[PDB]
Amino acid sequence: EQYPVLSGAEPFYAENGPVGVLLVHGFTGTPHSMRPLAEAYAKAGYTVCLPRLKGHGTHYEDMERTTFHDWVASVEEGYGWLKQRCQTIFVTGLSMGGTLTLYLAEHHPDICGIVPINAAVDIPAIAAGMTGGGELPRYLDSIGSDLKNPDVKELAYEKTPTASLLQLARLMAQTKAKLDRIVCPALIFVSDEDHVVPPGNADIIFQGISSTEKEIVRLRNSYHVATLDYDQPMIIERSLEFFAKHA
Ligand SMILES: *[P@](=O)(CCCN=[N+]=[N-])OCCCCCCCCCCCCCCCC
């Protein structure tokens, strides 16, 4: 990985109480989208790990070299960091961060609870792009930022490698097929007007998981990047309530 990490894309750690929260940012995104959550959780006395996914926060040419196994490894590392100083671990994530949240819970039953936010397990737009017939460039122009608050700017790549999109699709496929192995408590956030990840994904995750304790909280004044959007304080308040309930 050959480019410098952008300002605001650095990983974030905090060693506080014996209860830990792993925060996973999204595809082409940076820890910048999860930072206000991580700080709010850290102030509440929680040990937080906000890792920077491999190939992210630098340059899109760096991400092109990475597989989803790399992104998983970045999260498994954060999970291992939390596992060495916590006995109870929650995982939360936005978009693909939500996908990796689900992925982790499918492999680690010790997860006390998960809080996916606009998690993606099925994006029909990807399949639609490679059946168009036309030539498919090596790098595609990224989808515009999906935020209701106009004063907020997201830290994400201007371009998206085709190879990375294929890696994302494979991750979502393996994640969606293994949903029934999640039994831990789940707090699913979903924006009604998500223009990137179809809101129906929350339904798929809800019906897929074997968790007896699951709930869908619907965000009404936020687009895709809800964690920076208007419903940020609500997400924080609900999550802390969720954490304290199962800690
Ligand atoms: P989340 O992972 C990101 C949220 C925070 N990160 N940021 N910013 O969003 C899920 C990613 C899904 C994006 C897919 C949209 C691309 C559709 C266009 C596809 C055209 C090219 C596809 C052909 C490749 C086979």
Author numbering: 3 to 249
What sentences appear in the manuscript?
Monoacylglycerol lipases (MGLs) play an important role in lipid catabolism across all kingdoms of life by catalyzing the release of free fatty acids from monoacylglycerols. Here, we present a comprehensive study of five crystal structures of MGL from Bacillus sp. H257 in its free form and in complex with different substrate analogs and the natural substrate 1-lauroylglycerol. Crystallographic studies of MGLs have resulted in the determination of three-dimensional structures of human MGL (hMGL) and its ortholog from a moderately thermophilic soil bacterium Bacillus sp. H-257 (bMGL) in free form and in complex with inhibitors. Both MGLs possess the expected α/β-hydrolase core domain harboring a catalytic triad. The occurrence of different conformations reveals a high degree of conformational plasticity of the cap region.
Therefore, we determined crystal structures of bMGL in complex with ligands of different alkyl chain lengths (12, 14, and 16 carbons; subsequently referred to as Cx ligands, whereby x refers to the number of carbons in the alkyl chain) to mimic the MG substrates myristoyl-, palmitoyl-, and stearoylglycerol. The bMGL·C14 (palmitoylglycerol mimic) and bMGL·C16 (stearoylglycerol mimic) ligand complexes were crystallized under the same condition equally yielding crystals of space group P21. These structures were determined at resolutions of 1.85 and 2.2 Å, respectively. The bMGL complex structures with the C14 and C16 ligands bound in the active site show clear electron densities for all residues of the cap region. Interestingly, chains A and B of the bMGL·C14 and bMGL·C16 ligand complexes show a partially restricted binding pocket and an open glycerol exit hole similar to conformation II. Chains C and D of the bMGL-C14, and bMGL-C16 ligand structures show even more pronounced restriction of access to the binding pocket accompanied by the closure of the glycerol exit hole denoted as conformation III. The terminal carbon atoms of both the C14 and C16 alkyl chains are located at approximately the same distance from the surface of the protein, close to residues that line the entrance of the binding pocket. The C16 ligand is also fully accommodated in the binding pocket, despite the four additional CH2 groups, due to alkyl chain bending. The necessity for bending might explain the lower substrate turnover rate of bMGL with respect to MGs with a longer fatty acid chain.
